[PDB]
Design a protein around this ligand. Structure first.
Ligand SMILES: C[S@@+](CC[C@H](N)C(=O)[O-])C[C@H]1O[C@@H](n2cnc3c(N)ncnc32)[C@H](O)[C@@H]1O
Ligand SMILES: [Mg+2]
Ligand SMILES: [Mg+2]
Ligand SMILES: [Mg+2]
Ligand SMILES: [Mg+2]
Ligand SMILES: [Mg+2]
Length: 333
RNA sequence: GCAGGGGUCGCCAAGCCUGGCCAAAGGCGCUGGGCCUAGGACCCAGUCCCGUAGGGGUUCCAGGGUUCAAAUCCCUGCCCCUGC
């Protein structure tokens, strides 16, 4: 539409200025005819333009040059405006998880299924994925899985996830995985000492183990057959066939010792402090996870257990208003 | 290497065809602040570097080069996973 014909010699320098005074119309693209450039501009006058532009220019009334070029908004952008109220009532969430090429939203079932489908639709439209789900139930069961409800894109739950350089087969509907724990996996990764024997008591599809590939031997344990199938595919996928030993079993009845022991089962980890201390060697170290309103009982209930030494204590994430997931590493003597 | 793919601001991942509101979307992580509950959460803000800002300085694996203008186009040094 309202263009500003200028010589290309001053294109960039002109665009810059026009952008600072916020005049460059952002709906159309800068076309070009010869030694000139047409720069879509918002309605202003010749003199105020002459003031901010140290050069010659015509306000040619060129043709639209096409039609508006919309800036694809962000899922968050649109969803924020359209539903601030229930986002504020806790029915729709702006945060979401993405595992491989699958996204998992959070929408309360109090919200209508038609809306949930439309929102799952925006997500598919506006977010780089192949499929969209939402959390159907909470994390429950001994396998620690959750119900999902497909909403858009492919109805698939198998995908490959990347974090810290490695890749992982994950079926978000048959096992427990949190893309959110990648940083946690990263710390511990810079601790494995190539001659360490690691015990992953609740290995899942194996992300913690794989993050400990430096060590000598790794023992990935898990009672969930579905988890073990994947764990195995990931060992091969990561060419770690001879460092990680998958073990379909209840950790309780497994005889292994190790200097590095991981207990990622924050809900019922306390029910296993014993079996760990067992597996862990004299000088060994046990990475323990749990929940609580604070670190108290976490350390209090480990004291009356052994010659421990709180190597490092931190907060992973709020579990609910107040309750937190904590990670303590213990030095055994 | 004859259907040929890839390295983007901690980890992921948009953009690249078609150069121009790109310091570069989102998610996660990290920081601060709310939230007695969506329970392995959720809301607000920040997150390349300097500033209170306006703005400035440096980035898209590393050079060179084309362009008024390059993460986007062109020969090219190192590295990596699918391959009538
Ligand atoms: C929290 S998940 C591991 C998640 C993984 N660290 C992640 O976030 O990517 C817990 C795993 O522990 C397993 N598990 C629970 N109890 C177990 C037991 N008694 N013996 C062996 N495995 C068990 C479950 O089957 C489940 O796969
Ligand atoms: Mg509430
Ligand atoms: Mg807080
Ligand atoms: Mg544009
Ligand atoms: Mg640029
Ligand atoms: Mg600042």
């Amino acid at each position: 539409p309202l263009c500003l014909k200028i010589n290309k010699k001053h294109g960039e320098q002109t665009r810059r200025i026009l952008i600072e005074n916020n005049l460059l119309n952002k709906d159309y693209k800068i076309t070009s005819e010869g030694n000139y450039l047409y720069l879509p501009i918002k309605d202003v006058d010749e003199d105020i333009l002459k003031s901010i532009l140290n050069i010659e220019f015509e306000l040619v009334d060129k043709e639209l040059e096409e039609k508006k070029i919309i800036k694809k908004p962000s899922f968050r952008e649109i969803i924020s405006k359209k539903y601030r109220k229930e986002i504020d009532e806790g029915l729709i969430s702006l945060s979401y998880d993405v595992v491989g090429d699958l996204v998992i939203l959070q929408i309360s079932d109090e919200v209508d299924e038609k809306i949930r489908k439309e929102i799952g639709e925006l997500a598919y439209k506006l977010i780089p994925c192949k499929g969209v789900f939402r959390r159907k139930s909470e994390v429950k069961g001994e396998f620690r899985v959750r119900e999902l409800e497909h909403l858009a894109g492919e109805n698939r739950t198998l995908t490959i996830h990347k974090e810290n350089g490695y890749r992982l087969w994950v079926d978000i509907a048959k096992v427990y995985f949190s893309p959110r724990l990648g940083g946690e996996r990263a710390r511990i990764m810079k601790k494995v000492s190539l001659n360490d024997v690691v015990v992953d008591m609740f290995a899942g599809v194996g992300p913690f183990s794989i993050a400990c590939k430096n060590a000598k031997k790794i023992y990935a344990i898990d009672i969930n057959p579905h988890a073990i199938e994947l764990l195995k595919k990931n060992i091969k996928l990561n060419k770690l066939e001879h460092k990680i030993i998958p073990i379909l079993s209840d950790v309780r009845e497994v005889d292994v010792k190790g200097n590095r022991v991981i207990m990622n089962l924050p809900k019922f980890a306390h029910k296993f402090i014993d079996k760990a201390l067992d597996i862990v060697e004299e000088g060994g170290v046990i990475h323990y996870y749990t929940i609580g309103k604070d670190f108290d009982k976490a350390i209090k209930l480990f004291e009356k257990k052994c010659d421990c030494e709180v190597l490092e204590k931190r907060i992973v994430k709020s579990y609910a208003p107040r309750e937190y997931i904590l990670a303590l590493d213990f030095k055994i003597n």
